[PDB]
Ligand binder design. Structure first.
Ligand SMILES: [Ca+2]
Ligand SMILES: [Ca+2]
Length: 170
């Protein structure tokens, strides 16, 4: 693809007053060249900074209150050390307060772009029964160029489990 820098943005509307809050989190995982579909080298989310500052959450929301994009993450893929050959991005729905799948989130949406070029948009309509989803993959070849592989894949897991398994091959 020749992808250099990606922004992943996610939006949703809040739960009704008095219901448990709806909280989606963006998470990214990096994988090593010698194990691209295996154990994450590290993960980035609202409670876990990148060790190298190249992938970072720009803003979060714990309730979806607010017009426009509620949570945004930047991935400076060009700057990743060559040891990293694959990055997976995903969205989890927090489960601690209530079992909630994408159909139970009001008007969820995502957008991924490189600069001003939109790469993907989705409403999670293919994963309505899931509690988390991977929403995109980037793979770097021997030429050094990052390719984006679209695809939304649903998971039935909670956030902590998802972060460990989100690299699995599809
Ligand atoms: Ca959140
Ligand atoms: Ca919102």
């Amino acid at each position: 693809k020749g992808i250099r820098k990606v922004e992943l943005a996610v939006k949703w509307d809040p739960s009704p007053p008095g219901d448990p809050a709806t909280d989606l989190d963006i998470v990214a995982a990096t994988f090593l060249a010698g194990d691209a579909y295996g154990k994450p080298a590290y993960v980035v989310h609202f409670d876990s900074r990148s060790p190298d500052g190249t992938i970072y959450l720009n803003r979060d929301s714990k309730d979806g209150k607010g017009f426009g994009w509620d949570e945004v993450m930047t991935l400076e893929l060009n700057r990743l050390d060559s040891r990293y050959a694959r990055v997976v991005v995903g969205v989890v729905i927090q489960q601690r307060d209530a079992h909630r799948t994408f159909v139970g989130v009001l008007n969820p949406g995502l957008r991924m772009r490189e600069g001003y070029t939109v790469l993907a948009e989705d409403d999670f309509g293919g994963v309505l029964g899931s509690t988390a989803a991977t929403v995109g993959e980037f793979v770097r070849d021997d030429s050094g160029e990052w390719t984006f592989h679209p695809g939304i894949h649903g998971y039935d897991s909670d956030p902590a489990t998802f972060a460990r398994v989100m690299g699995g091959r599809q």
